[PDB]
């Protein structure tokens, strides 16, 4: 409903910046410049469980250095 | 029904040429009267009166004029701009006849809009230039080409009667079912009807041949259903709507039915239009071709039909589409014959006809309300239209949601507003909080109502603190859970985690045990900092370290440990997640250096400013409470804990500190006006010299209510908490107030290094005054979600504008104003700001579907009881419970269930069970079915004044006791006006507080240490021990505590009852040898500071001289206005009653138990009758009132004496305002 992000039947790309830094793209958008794609378009679920195995640095602890 | 509109059509043929006037003038009759539809009357009834004439048109030679052609006009428009009668059986035709030169006519005609319509009028006109022609022959009049009006009658019942009629309905009401809501190019609402018939007419022609070559290349599609498409996705696009409800121009007569009719005959019916973003033009062209054949079967049903089946509510449709071409074409032999149109009729939104000519290129016509449309802004869409068939006509393949509809000098104003480049320093919190330190070292920098402390100081403890909490394990990159009250320990414990380099996680003690320790188990700070009275609840969390901090440490240095980095976490605040967990927001250290610097440089502090610490720390906002001030050299003040709830104690608390720069909450701010008078007004917000507000739509209306009150600078500011508290800022006073349009104050322009976007589904900007997804660019993005990489990919994406830069998802529905201001307008999602907190429904909603035996469950919000709809948000949260059993759920049993996994404001107030949960046709859960909830041992004698206090507020009669106050419709803006009504009704102060805990008639009814050693303030070095007066309380040496040094601890010791030294003693020499086993036990060895005040100044001059008995040295004995019992007497008994009567006084005559205060005065002056004088031999300080010989009648009691003045009384020489003077002499002395 409205925003294509909180489409729950959506497929959504995986994105990978300089940074190290996840975003999600629905499918049916021009893919923004910047950006590598990691994974191809995956359910809203699949994604929540790709995302929670390779990107894991998401921690105070973690931004301690660089 | 009712007699209709009276507004005609007005068109004038410009004829070329040899013109025959009085035998065409004779033509108009013949051909008027032939058509008996012309000779139609309304008298409410509507007829044909066939003994109605029509009268020669007047001729008028306008070839002498100075201007033939402008008073052609004039003469056309003064009969235009005359209301027609309807009634009478005046006909509503008039034709004219217009003379401009010896070969030119205007041949002017109106007709009534119930006699013709535009595709039937040169029906008529064609039929008199026959008879004229025939004439000019010289044969008879030609017969009537038109039908009887009987026989178009007996038509239509000829239809209405037959199965294409029921077969149309059925059709026209499926139709309306999935009908969209209509759409409109104007940002007003949009009416049912419209008076205006004179309107805006614009004609533009499209030289630049893009259409020409975009229809070449879709050989096959048809240049009406191409040129349509086009249409319907401009207009889509223009608004950000891709499903929208149209009108489309058909026929109720078809065939030789229509071109013999006298009319009307056009037929607008409602046209659901879907722009699908990844289909290309032609697709949409032959999905809307394909959808209007099916349509046109059903065309000959009446639109007035759809309507009736269905006063000023929304209409069905906005704008009107038209394809349609009208032959106006005459043939007069050697005469041109041009058809020139004057009055069409009302347009309610915009009407667009579009033209493709036969040389391939467009045309259309636009008219538009003059109330919704002018000039300018429909060129400056019809050049939208120009590019967007530009863009086609390059790639034909171009998908439909990803053409481009902004203009190119507004990409250029979304270039300006976003300029927000502003280089700052690569430092963090604690630089500049150690910079300004540097700078005014002995200013004031934190206060509440026991401390005060300079910025020195409060860098020499912030600095202990952090050594300690290094000493504990906190290393740089660390989390620390802070649990603290309100007090100036909880800014330091922020300060030394900053100072440690670790991010704070701030708690609510208010939250359930099972929340805390899940947030706990999420963030897993090193350490836990709170008090030993919290601490009992934090058992039950494992590997868990913990810390008391609720007294100051022994300072060494004020050296700033420079372990604070900038790509540290600054904070962590967790909100509520649609999963049903919460998440934590982490804030980066560069982010919120960035908000604080454009702070105050936007809104710039000194060191005359005082900001009020009042946000509780779990709401970001508190963030530039605990440390904007301290990169100024503002002084902060602690409110008390659980004022923030109270508008009196608010009031009271800025007139307290002067304070002058504060925050609010838009329902905060609503409910504290209503408690403000102009005389209160200026008794405490005489100080404020700028406020804040954010958190929610700010109404401008309460802005104005607010400059009339104080005249103080209101500001709005926008932001979520993954923007580090505020992203934009608007001024909420003075000549942009004054300027708002709209209901709320705009969330206006961004902040230093920030971006604002507003984007639709295919991420696009959205031209000016459109809606759209509102997206944040910048330095001031947080650094994502706590253990949440799925929730950060999601809310923080990637940023097409900017490559490789990320941009985070609001939520937030938002557009742009003229002025460059956003303007916000809703939200996208099912997350909900009730009174300024955030509070998401799905997660309410996954709690209740995990309960016993639940089957379905809905949070809603809505206002249960208008009465009590008085200013701010009245919503409250009802949930709707289905058992999966069928069985009773006793709902009151889940909602103490609940109350033990949500926090308080996110329980429902109601739980309601339900059969089955109210859903639609389509399936979707209709919440305006869902039943607002309906409004036993009788009242009392005591509760039957508050009781009846509901009854005001509420509006409802409540009669019997266990009322809940929320339950009714109540909230904790409306218990703000009850514990402030319920305070004038008894001698007791209740506070808003007291209502939130116990919100029930007789719970209600049922709602300064008593004890020997009275803690006013336990420091870590010296302690000051204050000596009760004759009351027997040391409860008035509260205001001594700010003036001193704080490492000093303040015990005073007082006499209470039963089993007291006052009681208990004969002599008083057997209480002043008893307060020397209370005071000898906690310092057996000295030095000693002692204080007395009356009878506790003889108390403490026995006390320093039993302790020159030993052994230890007094250093410090002070004596307000003592004297010595050698100075029963009366006159004294007069000033201990003052005494007395001041001391009660102040007790604001809450409570009773307390006979032992005045017990106490009357043991107290048997006790002065047996008094004797002690030498002595040492130094003591005197304070005495100049309004009531010091020193002789003390000299052979204390060898040394000095004394200060002060103009007061026996009686005023404790209060506050005297130890304004007297506080800081203590403090110089016991140096
Ligand atoms: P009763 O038992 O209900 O008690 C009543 C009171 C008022 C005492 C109680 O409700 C209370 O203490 N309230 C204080 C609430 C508070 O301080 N909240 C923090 C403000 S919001 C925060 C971030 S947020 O994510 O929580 N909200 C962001 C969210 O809010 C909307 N929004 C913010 N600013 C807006 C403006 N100016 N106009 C319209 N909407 C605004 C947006 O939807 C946004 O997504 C802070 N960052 C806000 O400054
Ligand atoms: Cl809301």
Same mark, same amino acid.
């Given at each position: 409903?409205?925003?294509?992000?909180?489409?729950?039947?959506?497929?959504?790309?995986?994105?990978?910046?300089?940074?190290?830094?996840?975003?999600?793209?629905?499918?049916?958008?021009?893919?923004?410049?910047?950006?590598?794609?990691?994974?191809?378009?995956?359910?809203?679920?699949?994604?929540?469980?790709?995302?929670?195995?390779?990107?894991?640095?998401?921690?105070?602890?973690?931004?301690?250095?660089? | 029904?009712?007699?209709?509109?009276?507004?005609?059509?007005?068109?004038?043929?410009?004829?070329?040429?040899?013109?025959?006037?009085?035998?065409?003038?004779?033509?108009?009759?013949?051909?008027?009267?032939?058509?008996?539809?012309?000779?139609?009357?309304?008298?409410?009834?509507?007829?044909?009166?066939?003994?109605?004439?029509?009268?020669?048109?007047?001729?008028?030679?306008?070839?002498?004029?100075?201007?033939?052609?402008?008073?052609?006009?004039?003469?056309?428009?003064?009969?235009?701009?005359?209301?027609?009668?309807?009634?009478?059986?005046?006909?509503?035709? *008039?034709?004219?006849?217009?003379?401009?030169?010896?070969?030119? =006519?205007?041949?002017?005609?109106?007709?009534?809009?119930?006699?013709?319509?535009?595709?039937?009028?040169?029906?008529?006109?064609?039929?008199?230039?026959?008879?004229?022609?025939?004439?000019?022959?010289?044969?008879?009049?030609?017969?009537?080409? *038109?039908?009887?009006?009987?026989?178009?009658?007996?038509?239509?019942?000829?239809?209405?009667?037959?199965?294409?009629?029921?077969?149309?309905?059925?059709?026209?009401?499926?139709?309306?079912?999935?009908?969209?809501?209509?759409?409109?190019?104007?940002?007003?609402?949009?009416?049912?009807?419209?008076?205006?018939?004179?309107?805006?007419?614009?004609?533009?022609?499209?030289?630049?041949?893009?259409?020409?070559?975009?229809?070449?290349?879709?050989?096959?599609?048809?240049?009406?259903?191409?040129?349509?498409?086009?249409?319907?996705?401009?207009? &889509?696009?223009?608004?950000?709507?891709?499903?929208?409800?149209?009108?489309?121009?058909?026929?109720?007569?078809?065939?030789?039915?229509?071109?013999?009719?006298?009319?009307?005959?056009?037929?607008?019916?409602?046209?659901?239009?879907?722009?699908?973003?990844?289909?290309?033009?032609?697709?949409?062209?032959?999905?809307?071709?394909?959808?209007?054949?099916?349509?046109?079967?059903?065309?000959?049903?009446?639109?007035?039909?759809?309507?009736?089946?269905?006063?000023?509510?929304?209409?069905?449709?906005?704008?009107?589409?038209?394809?349609?071409?009208?032959?106006?074409?005459?043939?007069?032999?050697?005469?041109?014959?041009?058809?020139?149109?004057?009055?069409?009729?009302?347009?309610?939104?915009?009407?667009?006809?579009?033209?493709?000519?036969?040389? %391939?290129?467009?045309?259309?016509?636009?008219?538009?309300?003059?109330?919704?449309?002018?000039?300018?802004?429909?060129?400056?869409?019809?050049?939208?239209?120009?590019?967007?068939?530009?863009?086609?006509?390059?790639?034909?393949?171009?998908?439909?949601?990803?053409?481009?509809?902004?203009?190119? &000098?507004?990409?250029?104003?979304?270039?300006?507003?976003?300029?927000?480049?502003?280089?700052?320093?690569?430092?963090?919190?604690?630089?500049?909080?150690?910079?300004?330190?540097?700078?005014?070292?002995?200013?004031?920098?934190?206060?509440?109502?026991?401390?005060?402390?300079?910025?020195?100081?409060?860098?020499?403890?912030?600095?202990?603190?952090?050594?300690?909490?290094?000493?504990?394990?906190?290393?740089?990159?660390?989390?620390?859970?802070?649990?603290?009250?309100?007090?100036?320990?909880?800014?330091?414990?922020?300060?030394?985690?900053?100072?440690?380099?670790?991010? =704070?996680?701030?708690?609510?003690?208010?939250?359930?045990?099972?929340?805390?320790?899940?947030?706990?188990?999420?963030?897993?700070?090193?350490?836990?900092?709170?008090?030993?009275?919290?601490?009992?609840?934090?058992?039950?969390?494992?590997?868990?370290?913990?810390?008391?901090?609720?007294?100051?440490?022994?300072? #060494?240095?004020?050296?700033?440990?420079?372990?604070?980095?900038?790509?540290?976490?600054?904070?962590?605040?967790?909100?509520?997640?649609?999963?049903?967990?919460?998440?934590?927001?982490?804030?980066?250290?560069?982010?919120?250096?960035?908000?604080?610097?454009?702070?105050?440089?936007?809104?710039?502090?000194?060191?005359?400013?005082?900001?009020?610490?009042?946000?509780?720390?779990?709401?970001?906002?508190?963030?530039?409470?605990?440390?904007?001030?301290?990169?100024? %050299?503002?002084?902060?003040?602690?409110?008390?804990?659980?004022?923030?709830?109270?508008?009196?104690?608010?009031?009271?608390?800025?007139?307290?500190?002067?304070?002058?720069?504060?925050?609010?909450?838009?329902?905060?701010?609503?409910?504290?006006?209503?408690?403000?008078?102009?005389?209160?007004?200026?008794?405490?917000?005489?100080?404020?010299?700028?406020?804040?507000?954010?958190?929610?739509?700010?109404?401008?209306?309460?802005?104005?209510? =607010?400059?009339?009150?104080?005249?103080?600078?209101?500001?709005?500011?926008?932001?979520?908490?993954?923007?580090?508290?505020?992203?934009?800022?608007?001024?909420?006073?003075?000549?942009?107030?004054?300027?708002?349009?709209?209901?709320?104050?705009?969330?206006?322009?961004?902040?230093?290094?920030?971006?604002?976007?507003?984007?639709?589904?295919?991420?696009?900007?959205?031209?000016?005054?459109?809606?759209?997804?509102?997206?944040?660019?910048?330095?001031?993005?947080? #650094?994502?979600?706590?253990?949440?990489?799925?929730?950060?990919?999601?809310?923080?994406?990637?940023?097409?504008?900017?490559?490789?830069?990320?941009?985070?998802?609001?939520?937030?529905?938002?557009?742009?104003?003229?002025? &460059?201001?956003?303007?916000?307008?809703?939200?996208?999602?099912?997350?909900?700001?009730?009174?300024?907190?955030?509070?998401?429904?799905?997660?309410?909603?996954?709690?209740?579907?995990?309960?016993?035996?639940?089957?379905?469950?809905?949070?809603?919000?809505?206002?249960?009881?208008?009465?009590?709809?008085?200013?701010?948000?009245?919503?409250?949260?009802?949930?709707?419970?289905?058992?999966?059993?069928?069985?009773?759920?006793?709902?009151?049993?889940? #909602?103490?269930?609940?109350?033990?996994?949500?926090?308080?404001?996110?329980?429902?107030?109601?739980?309601?069970?339900?059969?089955?949960?109210?859903?639609?046709?389509? %399936?979707?859960?209709?919440?305006?079915?869902?039943?607002?909830?309906?409004?036993?041992?009788?009242?009392?004698?005591?509760?039957?004044?508050?009781?009846?206090?509901?009854?005001?507020?509420?509006?409802?009669?409540?009669?019997?006791?266990?009322?809940?106050?929320?339950?009714?419709?109540?909230?904790?803006?409306?218990?703000?006006?009850?514990?402030?009504?319920?305070?004038?009704?008894?001698?007791?102060?209740?506070?808003?507080?007291?209502?939130?805990?116990?919100?029930?008639?007789?719970?209600?009814?049922?709602?300064? &240490?008593?004890?020997?050693?009275?803690?006013?303030?336990?420091?870590?070095?010296?302690?000051? *021990?204050?000596?009760?007066?004759?009351?027997?309380?040391?409860?008035?040496?509260?205001?001594?505590?700010?003036?001193?040094?704080?490492?000093?601890?303040?015990?005073?010791?007082?006499?209470?009852?039963?089993?007291?030294?006052?009681?208990?003693?004969?002599?008083?020499?057997?209480?002043?040898?008893?307060?020397?086993?209370?005071?000898?036990?906690?310092?057996?060895?000295?030095?000693?500071?002692?204080?007395?005040?009356?009878?506790?100044?003889?108390?403490?001059?026995?006390?320093?001289?039993?302790?020159?008995?030993?052994?230890?040295?007094?250093?410090?004995?002070?004596?307000?206005?003592?004297?010595?019992?050698?100075?029963?007497?009366?006159?004294?008994?007069?000033?201990?009653?003052?005494?007395?009567?001041?001391?009660?006084?102040?007790?604001?005559?809450?409570?009773?138990?307390?006979?032992?205060?005045?017990?106490?005065?009357?043991?107290?002056?048997?006790?002065?009758?047996?008094?004797?004088?002690?030498?002595?031999?040492?130094?003591?300080?005197?304070?005495?009132?100049?309004?009531?010989?010091?020193?002789?009648?003390?000299?052979?009691?204390?060898?040394?004496?000095?004394?200060?003045?002060?103009?007061?009384?026996?009686?005023?020489?404790?209060?506050?305002?005297?130890?304004?003077?007297?506080?800081?002499?203590?403090?110089?002395?016991?140096?």
């Amino acid at each position: 409903f409205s925003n294509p992000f909180d489409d729950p039947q959506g497929a959504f790309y995986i994105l990978r910046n300089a940074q190290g830094q996840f975003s999600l793209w629905p499918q049916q958008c021009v893919l923004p410049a910047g950006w590598d794609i990691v994974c191809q378009p995956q359910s809203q679920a699949s994604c929540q469980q790709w995302l929670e195995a390779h990107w894991r640095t998401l921690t105070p602890t973690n931004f301690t250095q660089l | 029904s009712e007699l209709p509109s009276a507004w005609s059509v007005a068109h004038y043929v410009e004829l070329t040429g040899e013109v025959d006037s009085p035998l065409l003038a004779r033509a108009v009759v013949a051909g008027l009267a032939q058509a008996d539809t012309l000779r139609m009357r309304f008298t409410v009834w509507q007829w044909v009166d066939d003994a109605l004439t029509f009268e020669l048109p007047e001729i008028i030679d306008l070839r002498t004029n100075i201007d033939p052609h402008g008073t052609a006009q004039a003469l056309m428009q003064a009969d235009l701009q005359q209301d027609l009668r309807v009634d009478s059986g005046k006909p509503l035709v *008039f034709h004219q006849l217009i003379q401009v030169a010896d070969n030119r =006519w205007y041949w002017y005609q109106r007709y009534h809009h119930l006699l013709v319509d535009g595709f039937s009028f040169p029906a008529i006109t064609r039929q008199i230039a026959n008879i004229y022609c025939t004439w000019l022959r010289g044969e008879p009049t030609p017969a009537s080409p *038109f039908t009887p009006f009987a026989d178009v009658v007996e038509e239509y019942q000829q239809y209405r009667e037959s199965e294409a009629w029921q077969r149309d309905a059925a059709f026209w009401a499926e139709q309306r079912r999935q009908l969209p809501p209509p759409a409109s190019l104007s940002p007003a609402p949009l009416p049912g009807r419209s008076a205006s018939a004179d309107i805006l007419r614009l004609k533009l022609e499209f030289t630049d041949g893009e259409f020409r070559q975009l229809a070449t290349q879709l050989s096959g599609v048809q240049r009406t259903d191409l040129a349509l498409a086009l249409a319907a996705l401009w207009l &889509g696009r223009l608004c950000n709507r891709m499903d929208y409800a149209a009108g489309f121009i058909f026929m109720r007569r078809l065939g030789s039915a229509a071109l013999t009719a006298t009319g009307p005959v056009l037929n607008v019916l409602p046209l659901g239009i879907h722009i699908a973003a990844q289909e290309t033009l032609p697709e949409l062209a032959t999905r809307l071709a394909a959808q209007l054949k099916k349509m046109r079967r059903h065309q000959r049903y009446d639109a007035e039909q759809i309507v009736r089946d269905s006063a000023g509510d929304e209409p069905l449709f906005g704008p009107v589409l038209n394809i349609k071409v009208f032959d106006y074409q005459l043939d007069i032999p050697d005469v041109q014959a041009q058809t020139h149109t004057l009055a069409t009729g009302p347009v309610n939104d915009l009407e667009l006809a579009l033209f493709p000519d036969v040389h %391939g290129d467009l045309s259309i016509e636009i008219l538009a309300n003059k109330q919704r449309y002018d000039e300018p802004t429909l060129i400056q869409h019809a050049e939208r239209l120009k590019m967007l068939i530009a863009q086609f006509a390059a790639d034909p393949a171009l998908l439909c949601g990803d053409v481009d509809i902004m203009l190119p &000098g507004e990409y250029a104003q979304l270039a300006q507003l976003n300029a927000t480049q502003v280089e700052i320093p690569e430092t963090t919190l604690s630089a500049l909080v150690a910079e300004q330190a540097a700078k005014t070292p002995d200013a004031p920098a934190l206060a509440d109502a026991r401390y005060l402390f300079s910025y020195r100081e409060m860098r020499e403890q912030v600095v202990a603190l952090a050594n300690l909490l290094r000493e504990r394990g906190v290393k740089p990159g660390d989390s620390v859970a802070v649990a603290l009250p309100r007090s100036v320990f909880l800014t330091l414990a922020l300060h030394a985690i900053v100072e440690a380099g670790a991010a =704070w996680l701030p708690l609510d003690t208010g939250y359930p045990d099972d929340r805390l320790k899940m947030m706990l188990e999420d963030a897993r700070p090193s350490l836990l900092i709170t008090t030993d009275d919290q601490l009992p609840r934090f058992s039950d969390v494992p590997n868990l370290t913990s810390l008391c901090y609720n007294a100051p440490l022994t300072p #060494q240095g004020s050296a700033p440990l420079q372990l604070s980095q900038p790509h540290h976490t600054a904070y962590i605040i967790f909100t509520s997640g649609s999963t049903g967990r919460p998440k934590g927001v982490m804030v980066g250290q560069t982010a919120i250096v960035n908000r604080l610097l454009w702070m105050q440089n936007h809104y710039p502090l000194t060191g005359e400013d005082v900001v009020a610490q009042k946000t509780p720390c779990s709401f970001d906002v508190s963030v530039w409470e605990f440390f904007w001030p301290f990169i100024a %050299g503002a002084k902060l003040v602690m409110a008390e804990p659980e004022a923030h709830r109270d508008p009196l104690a608010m009031q009271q608390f800025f007139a307290e500190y002067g304070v002058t720069t504060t925050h609010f909450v838009p329902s905060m701010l609503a409910a504290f006006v209503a408690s403000l008078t102009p005389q209160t007004a200026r008794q405490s917000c005489a100080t404020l010299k700028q406020v804040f507000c954010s958190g929610e739509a700010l109404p401008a209306d309460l802005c104005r209510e =607010w400059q009339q009150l104080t005249g103080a600078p209101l500001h709005n500011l926008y932001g979520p908490t993954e923007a580090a508290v505020d992203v934009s800022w608007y001024p909420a006073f003075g000549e942009e107030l004054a300027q708002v349009r709209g209901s709320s104050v705009p969330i206006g322009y961004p902040v230093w290094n920030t971006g604002l976007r507003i984007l639709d589904a295919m991420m696009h900007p959205v031209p000016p005054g459109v809606a759209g997804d509102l997206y944040l660019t910048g330095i001031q993005l947080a #650094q994502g979600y706590l253990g949440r990489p799925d929730l950060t990919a999601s809310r923080f994406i990637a940023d097409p504008f900017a490559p490789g830069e990320r941009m985070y998802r609001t939520g937030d529905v938002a557009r742009w104003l003229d002025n &460059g201001a956003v303007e916000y307008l809703g939200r996208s999602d099912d997350q909900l700001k009730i009174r300024g907190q955030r509070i998401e429904l799905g997660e309410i909603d996954r709690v209740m579907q995990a309960l016993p035996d639940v089957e379905q469950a809905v949070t809603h919000a809505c206002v249960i009881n208008q009465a009590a709809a008085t200013g701010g948000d009245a919503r409250q949260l009802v949930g709707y419970l289905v058992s999966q059993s069928g069985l009773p759920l006793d709902t009151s049993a889940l #909602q103490a269930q609940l109350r033990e996994t949500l926090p308080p404001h996110m329980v429902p107030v109601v739980l309601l069970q339900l059969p089955q949960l109210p859903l639609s046709a389509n %399936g979707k859960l209709d919440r305006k079915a869902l039943p607002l909830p309906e409004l036993r041992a009788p009242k009392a004698g005591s509760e039957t004044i508050i009781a009846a206090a509901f009854s005001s507020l509420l509006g409802c009669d409540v009669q019997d006791a266990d009322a809940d106050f929320f339950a009714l419709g109540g909230h904790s803006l409306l218990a703000m006006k009850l514990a402030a009504q319920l305070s004038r009704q008894v001698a007791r102060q209740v506070t808003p507080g007291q209502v939130m805990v116990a919100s029930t008639v007789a719970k209600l009814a049922t709602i300064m &240490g008593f004890e020997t050693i009275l803690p006013l303030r336990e420091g870590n070095g010296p302690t000051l *021990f204050c000596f009760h007066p004759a009351s027997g309380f040391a409860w008035q040496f509260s205001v001594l505590s700010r003036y001193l040094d704080p490492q000093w601890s303040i015990i005073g010791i007082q006499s209470p009852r039963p089993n007291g030294p006052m009681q208990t003693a004969a002599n008083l020499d057997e209480v002043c040898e008893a307060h020397l086993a209370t005071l000898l036990e906690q310092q057996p060895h000295g030095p000693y500071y002692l204080l007395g005040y009356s009878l506790g100044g003889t108390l403490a001059q026995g006390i320093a001289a039993r302790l020159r008995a030993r052994g230890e040295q007094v250093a410090f004995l002070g004596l307000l206005d003592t004297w010595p019992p050698e100075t029963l007497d009366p006159e004294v008994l007069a000033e201990i009653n003052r005494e007395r009567e001041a001391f009660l006084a102040a007790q604001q005559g809450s409570t009773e138990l307390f006979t032992t205060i005045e017990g106490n005065y009357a043991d107290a002056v048997r006790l002065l009758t047996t008094a004797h004088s002690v030498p002595f031999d040492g130094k003591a300080t005197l304070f005495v009132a100049e309004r009531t010989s010091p020193e002789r009648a003390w000299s052979p009691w204390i060898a040394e004496l000095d004394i200060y003045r002060q103009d007061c009384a026996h009686v005023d020489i404790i209060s506050p305002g005297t130890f304004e003077k007297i506080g800081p002499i203590i403090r110089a002395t016991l140096n």
